[PDB]
Every structure is written in structure tokens, then in C-alpha cells.
């Protein structure tokens, strides 16, 4: 269990993804 469980967020705010491409897949602009 490593490499960023985004499942433990309710959603992920696009605001803390930086350039992380996997982050930018799930995230949500606000």
C-alpha cells in the first residue's frame, strides 16, 4: 500500500497536483 491512495480522499482538488500527471487524471478544478 504505497504510491498515493487517492481513494482515501473524498475527491482530490486540482490545486495540489502540480505537474503530477496521475494526479491530474482524477482531480477536480474548483
Amino acid at each position: 500500500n504505497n504510491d498515493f491512495h487517492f481513494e482515501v480522499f473524498n475527491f482530490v482538488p486540482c490545486s495540489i497536483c502540480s505537474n503530477n500527471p496521475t494526479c491530474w487524471a482524477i482531480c477536480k478544478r474548483i
Epitope: N10, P13, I16, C17, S18, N19
Partner: antibody
Framework: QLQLQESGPGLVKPSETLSLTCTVS??????????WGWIRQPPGKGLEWIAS???????YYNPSLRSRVTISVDTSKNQFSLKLSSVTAADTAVYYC?????????????????WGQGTLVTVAS | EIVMTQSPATLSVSPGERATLSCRAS??????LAWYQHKPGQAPRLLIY???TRATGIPARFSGSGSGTDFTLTISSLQSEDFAVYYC????????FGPGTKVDLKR
């Protein structure tokens, strides 16, 4: 300078809910790219993180506690709160509020800086 | 499931020498590791993040080294002020802390 102050009941009866509030001062919670969280330490056990909340309403959970945690932010009074349901003696602890730096950039950011001074909760019949 | 251990649980150290101190992780955590200082009755304080990076406001006597499974926090020229418990925290997936190690002073 940024400061966090917990406030909440010293005592809560088992099978009921514990609620705490952190009042941040010397900095504003909104707008801000920082999550705001709670960590707890039972007597003679380690630290365990609980949940954090971002101005945007995103909530970062410890999964082992997620089912029991409600965490909210009142951006105007500069206050985030924790509610923990159906408490047991397993929940007696010092509860700290903290600023949670989350970042998924180049160099990850997943820590707490700085903290409040803790408040002792006791779950007692 | 990750699991953080620290050793030794407790450590007595002459005022002035170096206290070398460790954190270990079951699986690997790259360099997603912080260290906190917690003097009793006071608030925890972030010492190092990045597994090597000293947080702003922290003396150069406290340095972190290590990676994957083995980390080490060392306090050179230990002061009496430094007496407290030190926790490590991995952030590979989410925040998990170690049991902590109590640093006592000798005199």
C-alpha cells in the same frame, strides 16, 4: 505568526460523539492551499492521524477511522472542527490540530507543520 | 500495510555528544519521511522533511539521512534543551508515525 488552539470537552460519555474545534489565528484558512487536520495520541501509544480538510472541501482521511469521522471548516470564523462518533475508551487521547501540507508535486509534501498544543479527551462512563 | 519501527526505544546521551537515532519501514518509502520533535507539554515540531531537509528555523545540529527502508536522525553536540521524544513519519501513501524514541540526558 501562525497559531492553532484546540478547544473541546475534557469528558465525553461512551457511545456518544466527541467534537473539537481548532481556531487558527495569525493566518487565514481561506483562501489557502493547505489542509487542516487532527492528530491524536492515546496515553502511552503512538501518534495517529485522523483527517484533514481543505478550503475547497476536499477531505483527506485516515481510512481506519473514516467511517467515524466528520470534519468541517468554517472559513469565516477561521475554524475547522472534528466530530468522532460512537466513542469508546479507545478514543481517550490528546487530540492535536495541525496544518497539513499536502502536495503531489516534485518533492512530495505530506506532513504537519505546525501543531497546536493538544487537548485531553477522556472517554468515561 | 506499512509499519514504522524506531530504535532504540530510549537513549541516554551525555550533554554534548551526538545522539544517532533510527527509523525503519516494512516496505519502502523512498524519501517520503519526516521527523518530529516533541518536548513534554509543548507542541510537536517538524524537524525534517524530505528525509534530509531541515525545516525552516531548525539548527544545523539536527540532520536526517537515509532512504527506502532505513533512516537516521542525528543530533550533534546535544544540548540539555533537546530532551524529548522524537517521532518519524512516513508519507508514502498517507501519514503514519513511528513509536518514538525518548532521548534522556546524562549528567
Amino acid at each position: 505568526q501562525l497559531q492553532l488552539q484546540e478547544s473541546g470537552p475534557g469528558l465525553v460519555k461512551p457511545s456518544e460523539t466527541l467534537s473539537l474545534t481548532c481556531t487558527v489565528s495569525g493566518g487565514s484558512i481561506s483562501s489557502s492551499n493547505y489542509y487542516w487536520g487532527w492528530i491524536r495520541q492515546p496515553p502511552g501509544k503512538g501518534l495517529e492521524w485522523i483527517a484533514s480538510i481543505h478550503d475547497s472541501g476536499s477531505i483527506y482521511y485516515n481510512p481506519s477511522l473514516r467511517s467515524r469521522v466528520t470534519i468541517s471548516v468554517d472559513t469565516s470564523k477561521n475554524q475547522f472542527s472534528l466530530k468522532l462518533s460512537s466513542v469508546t475508551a479507545a478514543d481517550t487521547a490528546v487530540y492535536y490540530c495541525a496544518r497539513h501540507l499536502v502536495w503531489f508535486g516534485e518533492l512530495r509534501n505530506n506532513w504537519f507543520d505546525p501543531w497546536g498544543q493538544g487537548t485531553l479527551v477522556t472517554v468515561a462512563s | 500495510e506499512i509499519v514504522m519501527t524506531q530504535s532504540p526505544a530510549t537513549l541516554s546521551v551525555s550533554p554534548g555528544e551526538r545522539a544517532t537515532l533510527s527509523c525503519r519501514a516494512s516496505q519502502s518509502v523512498n524519501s517520503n519521511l519526516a521527523w518530529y520533535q516533541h518536548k513534554p507539554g509543548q507542541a510537536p515540531r517538524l524537524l525534517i522533511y524530505g528525509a534530509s531537509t531541515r525545516a525552516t528555523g531548525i539548527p544545523a545540529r539536527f540532520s536526517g539521512s537515509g532512504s527506502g527502508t532505513d533512516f537516521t536522525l542525528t543530533i550533534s553536540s546535544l544540548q540539555s534543551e533537546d530532551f524529548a521524544v522524537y517521532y518519524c513519519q512516513q508519507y508514502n501513501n498517507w501519514p503514519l508515525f513511528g513509536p518514538g524514541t525518548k532521548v534522556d540526558l546524562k549528567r
